[PDB]
Amino acid sequence: VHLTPEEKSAVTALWGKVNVDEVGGEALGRLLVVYPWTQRFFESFGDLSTPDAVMGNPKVKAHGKKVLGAFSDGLAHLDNLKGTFATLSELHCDKLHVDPENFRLLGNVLVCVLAHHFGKEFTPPVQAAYQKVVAGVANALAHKYH
Amino acid sequence: VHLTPEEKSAVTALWGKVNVDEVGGEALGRLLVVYPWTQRFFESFGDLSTPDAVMGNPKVKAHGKKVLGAFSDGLAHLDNLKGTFATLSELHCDKLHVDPENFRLLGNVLVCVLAHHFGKEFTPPVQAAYQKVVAGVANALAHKYH
Amino acid sequence: VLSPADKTNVKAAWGKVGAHAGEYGAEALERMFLSFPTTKTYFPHFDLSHGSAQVKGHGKKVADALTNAVAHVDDMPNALSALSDLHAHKLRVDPVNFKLLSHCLLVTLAAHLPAEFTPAVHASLDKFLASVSTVLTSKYR
Amino acid sequence: VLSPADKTNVKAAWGKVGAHAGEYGAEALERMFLSFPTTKTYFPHFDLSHGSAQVKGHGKKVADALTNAVAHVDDMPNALSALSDLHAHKLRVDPVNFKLLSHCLLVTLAAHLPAEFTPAVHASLDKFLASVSTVLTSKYR
Ligand code: HEM
Ligand code: HEM
Ligand code: HEM
Ligand code: HEM
């Protein structure tokens, strides 16, 4: 993606503040509740029947941390989102059969969790810089679909 | 846009059959009919009251050819759509104020026009070649948007 | 919302479809699989080689359903009721994919019915596909 | 469909917005323009600068309509008729932009109601906003 000096620093700053461990479990948790259809990729996860069940779910928790862990590593290679994610891109397509649209969903849910976690610190311009990253990560993961 | 040599060829091959003015008027009119909201740029054009009025609109007709004229010229540059449409991308954004969505819509109308025109010849594999081409041009007309 | 003209235009076009509904439904899905490769993620358990009995069976099922939808255009919700639950509770297909399938059906139809596919019928079909997709999607959450 | 629980989540959240609705309207707007530059194309006559009165003035109009939508959650189509007419016949804003504004809305809500903005409430607000956009575009064609 392309980000202005100002946008790169917005992104990085805010992210060093993030505890991935718990922002991931929230992002995934919220994905599963707001877009329940995404629940299809997680039948082995136990009970996802209630927001409460989904937020308290430990596999969700475990998984969210993982996802975001990866997401994190991407922030570090913002310059070449594609190269970074190809292996996961390939995995996502070939073995997981995860519709790339689910990447866009999570990305939007991540932004909401950010705004929610940081309140007013997460300003419009910050939001925008973060919207280009999410979009770029989603394209980075959709990149190897065939 | 990434097209295999075979995809470029189906693209050009079939295009050579295409009468620009004709398909230009057709696609543009069909756009204005199917997705009425698109008529917003076109108040100076006169009567757009009915499908018949639209499709018979000489203004629609004339705007249609100019548009596909450009399209047509851009197929000679499948390798640098971006470079080709940069200037027009800017004009659309700065002076015309055309939501790039209209480009994605026009592309689908186009593809439907080709299918209506070509019948059987427009095969599944051909469609896909052209879908890329249409995503290609839309992404390129949208690239200089700020 | 489908106007009465809309339904007239849908009932007419689809009529022409007639007996090819099945085959046009397979071609549509082959068209989607080809142009929009991501739709595949939902049929990893299908042999998606062109002509597969699976894609042929599936397309047939899809068409019936459209015809069911044409036949009951003044009460789609109720008619696709069962399909709606299936989509929302089991298959859970992302709602954007419907739009891609709609587009492929529209190209299949455009290519098969040179005569009927006027600006108007085109407008009406699209609205129709839009409505069908809305209904199959309405019970998502 | 907006469940009794949804309407209760929505009215409740909207309840917290209170008199800052205008304000959150403006910010949401601001969010949209900044994150999705293409939405700006609909407002070449405004000064889309940060702190702009116009945006401010529009932010308030937008917010009041949602306030109204909320008041009438069981009767949105009627309440928003002139709005649905206006966007459909005059403004002609592409339906895709409604999803963009809805997200910026959500985001402005997330950042303003830390306590309120629960997963469940995030869920109803998203449904509600999908319903609103559905109403507002219902007359486009
Ligand atoms: C877009 C950001 C995403 C990133 C960076 C990402 C990254 C990852 C990584 C790192 C793995 C690990 C597999 C292993 O540890 O070997 C994984 C697996 C997985 N991901 Fe993603 N993921 C993303 C989004 C999603 C979304 C949105 C979904 C579906 C809604 C999804 C579904 C899954 C599933 C089902 C697995 C495997 C779980 C298992 O073995 O049971 N991912 N993901
Ligand atoms: C392939 C897609 C498109 C191409 C290649 C294209 C190309 C063009 C060209 C070459 C012109 C004249 C530019 C000049 O003045 O030098 C133009 C003008 C314009 N375009 Fe586009 N266009 C596209 C899509 C659209 C669409 C979909 C709309 C509206 C929905 C639109 C709205 C306009 C308008 C209103 C003008 C000005 C016409 C006039 O002032 O007489 N364009 N476009
Ligand atoms: C115009 C919209 C659609 C119609 C009319 C439709 C109709 C149907 C029907 C009638 C069935 C068979 C149900 C049964 O046997 O009881 C089905 C199953 C299915 N559909 Fe939908 N569908 C549509 C959209 C989609 C989309 C867009 C996708 C994915 C891109 C999808 C994926 C599935 C899948 C994966 C199955 C089950 C496949 C199998 O295991 O055989 N459908 N659908
Ligand atoms: C929640 C969804 C939306 C709501 C509730 C909303 C509501 C409103 C209201 C109440 C007005 C003023 C009516 C008047 O005074 O005549 C308005 C005008 C307008 N809206 Fe919408 N709108 C929404 C979405 C959009 C979107 C997504 C856009 C474009 C990106 C848009 C573009 C405009 C424009 C350009 C105007 C008139 C501008 C002016 O001349 O001052 N609206 N809208």
- The 3-state secondary structure of chain C reads CCCHHHHHHHHHHHHHHHHHHHHHHHHHHHHHHHHCHHHHHHCCCCCCCCCCHHHHHHHHHHHHHHHHHHHCCCCHHHHCHHHHHHHHHHHCCCCHHHHHHHHHHHHHHHHHCCCCCCHHHHHHHHHHHHHHHHHHHCCCC
Token pair for residue B16?
């050579």
In one letter, which amino acid is A26?
Answer: E
Residue type, C133: S
In units of Å, what resolution does this entry have? 2.2
CATH of the domain at D136: 1.10.490.10
- Taking CA atoms only, the protein residue closest to ligand 2 atom 41 is B63
Minimal Cα distance from A51: which residue of D? D120
Residue A42, token pair as written in the block: 């997680």
Cβ–Cβ pairs < 8 A, chains A and C: 38
Decide whether any atom of ligand 4 lies within 6 Å of the D91 Cβ: yes
Binding-site residue ranges of D for heme b? 87
Residue D42 DSSP code: G
Whether B83 has its CB under 8 Å from any CB of chain D: the answer is no
Distance from C-alpha of A32 to C-alpha of A106, rounded to nearest angstrom? 9
The total of other beta-carbon atoms located within 10 Å of residue C90's CB is 9
Smallest Cα–Cα separation from B101: which of C120, C98, C106, D99? D99
Residue given tokens 């002139």 in the structure block: D82
Would you give the end-to-end CA distance of chain D in angstroms?
Answer: 22
The residue behind tokens 């830390």 is D114
In 10 A of CB D107, how many CB atoms? 26
DSSP-based helix, strand, coil % in chain D, nearest 5: 75, 0, 25
Place of tokens 């866009």: A104
Residues contacting D83, CB < 8 A, separation 6+:
D65, D135, D136
User: How far away, in angstroms, is A92 Cα from ligand 1 center?
Assistant: 7
Which residue in the block uniquely carries the two structure tokens 């997200």?
D103
* Token pair belonging to A72: 């994190």
Domain range for residue D72?
Answer: 1-141
Cα-to-centroid distance, D32 and ligand 4 (Å): 13
Do D and A touch, 3+ Cβ pairs within 8 Å? The answer is: yes
Tokens 């913002």 sit at which residue?
A78
**Using CA atoms, how far apart are residues A44 and A62, in angstroms rounded to an integer?**
13
C26 touches B at CB < 8 Å: no
> Which of A:24-63 have CB within 8 Å of D?
29-30, 33-34, 51, 54-55
Which ligand sits nearest to residue B103's alpha carbon? 2
Where do runs of H (alpha helix) occur along B35-119? 51-56, 58-74, 81-91, 101-118
Q: Check if the beta carbon of residue A67 is closer than 8 Å to that of residue A126.
A: no
Count CB atoms within 10 A of the CB of residue A8. 15
CB-based burial label for A62 (10 Å; 0-12, 13-18, 19+): middle
Distance A34 CA to ligand 1 centre (A): 18
CA nearest to C92, candidates C42, C132, C130, C17: C42
Could you give the CA distance from residue C67 to residue D2 in angstroms, rounded to a whole number? 29
Q: Residues 104-133, chain D: which have Cβ within 8 Å of B? A: none
Phi-psi region of C51 (alpha: psi -120 to 50; beta: other; left: phi over 0): left
Q: What CATH number has the domain spanning A1-146?
A: 1.10.490.10
The token duo for C126 is: 């699209």
Chain D residues lying within 8 Å of C127, measured CB to CB = 141
**Which site among A30, A35, A37, A54 would you substitute to test the C interface, given the most C Cβ atoms closer than 10 Å to its Cβ?**
A37
List of chain C residues whose C-beta atoms are within 8 Å of the C-beta of residue A40: 91-92
Name B128's Cβ contacts closer than 8 Å, sequence gap at least 6: B7, C31, C34, C35
- The Cα of D119 is separated from the nearest Cα of chain A by a number of Å equal to 6
Nearest CA-CA distance, residue D39 and chain B, Å: 7
Q: At what angle do helices D53-71 and D119-137 cross, to 10 degrees?
A: 100
Dihedral (CA of C44, C47, C50, C52) sign: negative
CA distance D124 to D132: 12
- Report the alpha-carbon distance of residue C73 to residue D62 in Å, rounded: 35
CA distances from A39 to A46, A79, B5, D120, D123 (A): 11, 32, 40, 15, 14
d(CA C86, ligand 3 centre) in Å: 9
Contacts of C97 (CB under 8 A, 6+ apart): A99, A101, C36, C38, C39, C42
Integer Cα distance of B134 and B130 in angstroms: 6
Count Cα neighbours of C44 within 13 Å in the Cβ-side half-sphere.
12
Domain count along chain D = 1
Could you give the C-alpha distances from D4 to B118, C138, D74, in angstroms and in order?
52, 16, 10
Cβ of residue C132 lying under 6 Å from some atom of ligand 3: yes
CA dist B37 → B102, C102, C141, D86 (Å) = 9, 20, 29, 11
For residues D129 and D106, the answer to whether their CB atoms sit within 8 Å is yes
Is-contact B77 B84, C-beta < 8 A?
A: yes
| CB within 8 Å: B34 and C119 | yes
Three-state SS across D70-96? Answer: HHCCCCHHHHCHHHHHHHHHHHCCCCC
Q: Is A41 in the pocket of ligand 1 (CB under 6 A)?
A: yes
